[model samples]
Target chain A: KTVVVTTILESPYVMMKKNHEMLEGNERYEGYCVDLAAEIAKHCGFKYKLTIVGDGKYGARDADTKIWNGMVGELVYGKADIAIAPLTITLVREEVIDFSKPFMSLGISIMIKKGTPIESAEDLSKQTEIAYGTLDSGSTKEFFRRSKIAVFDKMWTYMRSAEPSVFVRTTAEGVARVRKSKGKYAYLLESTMNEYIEQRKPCDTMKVCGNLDSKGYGIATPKGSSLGNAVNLAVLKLNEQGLLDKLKNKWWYDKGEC
Target chain B: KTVVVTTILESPYVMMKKNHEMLEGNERYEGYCVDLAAEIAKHCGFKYKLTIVGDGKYGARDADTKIWNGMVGELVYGKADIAIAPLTITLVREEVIDFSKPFMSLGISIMIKKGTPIESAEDLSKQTEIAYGTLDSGSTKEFFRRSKIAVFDKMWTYMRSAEPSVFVRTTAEGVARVRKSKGKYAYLLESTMNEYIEQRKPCDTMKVCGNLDSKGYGIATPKGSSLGNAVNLAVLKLNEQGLLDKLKNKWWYDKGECG
Candidate 1:
């Protein structure tokens, strides 16, 4: 069967290239995941097509509705055969999908609008004029809840108490919040995603301070899928051969604009 | 010419084997430096005889007499072709003899007899009951003298002025002082040496606090020697190939006795 791989249009990981209008199916996309999908297909001896997720969100279940969205939704309902993107591997998500061991490691980073007076984690936790938060249902939110630091305790109290949620639905929306808030808000997300946006055009947002926590992003497939074993081995083999590091440099550093 | 490699009979770095009665010359020695010296000889393509230093001291200059002692003295006075041991690379010593880039890294640490009330620098500085000092003319003593930390400032004052002289001439003397003091005196020395002692029999001494300073041990030769360049390159190559780490594991953990 031709594999229908679902991925999100996140920067560096998956994006429509300029002149994508003239490009055909699969050729329209050119990013880390696009090239990664090509490598996986070549090694597994399977033909595959890259499809962008319809909802444009990282997978999460609504608290009230109990339904999944984003690429996680696509995999749960069998709309896609595999997911190859910056999708985080979480214990909650793993019950419905199996993730291969991490191809890349990252940590949560703080995204601030340029010229923000904030300089450190202590600075973020101390001020009130500049509101800060993470993407909803993302690992950042969960990270703060279980954080052991005293500053996290204070930040968590503020995030939970604010009448209107400080969290946004998607990473792009969070970046938009930082740019439009005029230095009044900061966004917390994975360092890999944060670094990607900082390099692209209209580079007003910047990653500041050190990473909050460390984790890895894994290629995920549906639970009990027959393709899981083959893909996992393929990831390890790619890592051992230094191909994964090579692809990351190609996407993140070589193609960087700023 | 066969190289005369000078080393000290320091535990773990260089030592007499349990069955030394049947062995002769280099065969009598068994430790990390013994193995390291053999690898270096093989790579540099030189024949060597492992000789223990006549005076069991880690080299230092006499402030009044202006004479170098230990392995440094042996290299400078044309006694040995090379010195391969846990000899610290210090600025003062570098002026007299050339040293390769570090083959191993270590830091100064505090050693205490088991059940000692002293656990940290603060504990040692706050009380006078626990008499603590470092090896005389050793890197650890120099560190306390030159330290800018508030605790070290007070401790150094005490160490330098104590009437009976709290310092020992050798690491073994320092270790014996800690063992005999029965919690009354703590010794400050390099972490590598302290850790090795902790793993040996009568494991009553333990490293209680963090290291005081960071430094490395280098292979030393007399200044402007023909063999210096080759030995330096050989150390870097061994480090790159993971041989240094492998040897560290073989000596420190693989043959550990305490565990």
Candidate 2:
């Protein structure tokens, strides 16, 4: 059976090709995860199709109904055979799906317009002149909501109750807000995306301070999928062969605009 | 039944306390892993005894004998219930044992005498004026041995053939060689140990450049051990609570000797 791979369209991971309208099938999309999916399939000897998540969210479970949404939901409900994207590996996610060992490591980071007064999360939390927020329905937002750390807790309180609603529907929207807010908005996001944006065109933003925490991303499958063992070993083999590092450089730096 | 925890006696992870000779049982040692063992047991709700691995080596399997040895072997041979130490998570070891999501991240790093000229792995791989080696029978050595990367492959060839034998029996021996060799020797070891040594009293060694590769250490259990799930969740819980970070600072930097 052909593998149905679930992914999200995020910059440098999965993006529409310049001539996407003229293309069909996998040829229409390209980025890190695209290359990675091909490598994984080659190693695992499987034919696969890449399908973007319907809801455009990473994945989260509803509190009231306990229904999962997004790429994770796709796997939980058996809509996709595998998820090869920038989806984070978290304890909650692990309870429902089996993830291969991490293929990439990242952490929560702060992004600000160049020359913004903010130097750290503490700086953003203590004062209100400049506003900060995270992508809605994602790990960053959940990190703040779940954190008991004083500074992060205080920031979450402010963000949850802020006058205009500090959340954005997508990473692109968050980046655009930071670029157009005239230094009045800062976006809290994963360091991978934050650093990738720092090197993009019209580079007026910078990631500040050290990462707030550390974690990694994994290839996920339904909890008891038969392919889990092979995929996990493939990831380990690829890491040992330095293929993961090579891919990161290929997409994140080799094509850097700045 | 009490859990049998196997570990090594590496500095700042598991070390003989100052008054160790006068103490008994678990009281005989103290360090980061010691503290972590206590925490893991508390969270898992188990009483345990911490025993030093008999071989004093991190685990490796013999190429010819097909037998495993060290703390990893202890778990494999049923000598222990779990291992809580700075044991690296690697593909070979993972085949025989289960690892929790990494509790601490690190990489193979270069340790040079304070004035050594090396800046990166490429530099060391290309030069012969100074000598370097990694801990024998460990992941770092295995990394070089298995590397298809040109620089590391070249390094493995040089290290295995060097007349004086660059490989060391222990991490301390490697550090001592670097400190006393007066810039003539560099050591390749994990960054955690490299950074820890850089802060000791002599303070004459330094870790240079970025790490060669990224990986992590994990709490290990025998394959299919029933305790795996709870222990894994406990590690995640501890990390989210920031206990891991706090433990790192307490052991590595809070007591740094250099001003």
Candidate 3:
């Protein structure tokens, strides 16, 4: 059977050739998600075609009208078979799609500018002098929005103020903001993505802290896809076989572009 | 379908009369386990018989032979559909049977006799000049015996080697030792049970100091039973409805002597 697999190009998970302008989709076999889709499709006995999310993004609820987009949007609308990306399992997402046991373990973390005194999630809620926000179109943003805990409860208040530059659209821009500024700004992102960036040049440019609870990422399919069960089973079997760990090391440890 | 459920008489859960002229079996109702079994069966659409375990005991693996007994054996051998008692979930038990999400959370905690130098579990484990052991048959014992983590790993070695007159059975015996004696002994028991005991006449008689991680105590079933799924769902539903909380306070507030 043929399946349409979807993913986003978050670096270390997915990246493009430095000169992708000349190459086409057929040659876009790049990172962890690209390899994972290929490996899992082989295990599930199917052929698949990959598509970058149309907006080159992850999912979020549209603030004005409250609609979903990105990988979650694709699943909610019945557009893709599964997303093998580092999509987090959260309460809101769980109400709509089933997420498997985490293939990767990461806490929600804050990347502070060099001298920002924040060391934990609890710290953010305590310091009213500084403000914080997560990447606009990602899972971390939704986590704060949906959290019922006390500190996270305060972050929800700041996020709803509707001011320009209060919420940044991409993870890269958030990192750029923290790097360019002083102690006031911090970027909240998944620990795995944060760790990948931390290892790169101009060493220790950003610091990822705020030891929040860990959440799992899974291969998501629309609730009733025929391939959902087989694909979910494949993930457990592969993690047990050490394939996932091998791939993470291949991308994160090696200096290779992927 | 109507069913027979076997449970034990444990306080804040179930209680047997302190001086019943030879007490035994289904002698009480309206403890946490009592209300839990009643409500779970009601939600699950069934009738049931709640009786005491055959051995009149809780779950324990034999020290020498490693044989399982009490509610665990009954469920494994098909004598009960589930155990709704304040049974603590242990890694050893989780392997033989499936459990629902804990209706209540507990962890191995230390209950020290006040004015004892011991302020934490780490302190208790370091030098065991004083004796310390867990409640006779519960999760705290299993935790020490089978744990791979720090503090507990050392406590296990010390308790099994306590001087002849010190090691005691049942939390009552251990707590009695703490209060009556000169603060030389300590007790390790489940946090929930410890908290319930702390609020009684012995208030501050023994202070619970260890803040351990959460351990889930679930409704358990025989392996591969079809009833497991429905029973687990019943626990979660009961938990969300506040019935589980209402029942826990009912038993703990009134002193565990209901029938």
**Winning candidate number (TM-score):** 1
Tens-digit per-residue lDDT, A1-258, candidate 1: 799999988888888889998989999998888888898888888999889899787787777988888889999998998999998888878888899999988888888887898866778898898898888776678778767889988898889888688988878899999999999999988988887788665779888746777788899998889999989988998888767866776676444443
List runs of model 2 lying over 4 Å from the truth: A1-258
lDDT of each: 0.85, 0.90, 0.72
Q: Which prediction has more favorable lDDT, 1 or 2?
A: 2
Task: Indicate the DockQ of the complex predicted as candidate 1.
Answer: 0.02
Looking at model 1 chain A, report the run of 10 residues with the lowest lDDT sum. Answer: A249-258
Candidate 2 lDDT, B200-232, residue by residue in tens: 766678887468899999999999999878789
Give one digit per residue, the lDDT tens place, for model 2 in A115-166.
Answer: 8998789889999899999999988888999999999999999999998999
lDDT of 1 by residue, B1-259 (tens): 8999999888788989999999998999998899988999999999999998898777888889988998999999999999999999999899999999999989888899977976478778998888988877666777788789999989999999987889988789989999998789898888888877875656678886456678999999999998899888889998899888778767764444442
CAPRI tier for the interface of model 1:
incorrect
iRMS of candidate 3, Å: 26.4
Residue pairs with backbone overlap in model 2: none
| Model 3 CAPRI quality | incorrect
Q: Give all TM-scores, in the order shown.
A: 0.53, 0.53, 0.48
Compute the lDDT of residue A93 as modeled in candidate 3. 72
**Candidate 1 residue pairs that clash:** none
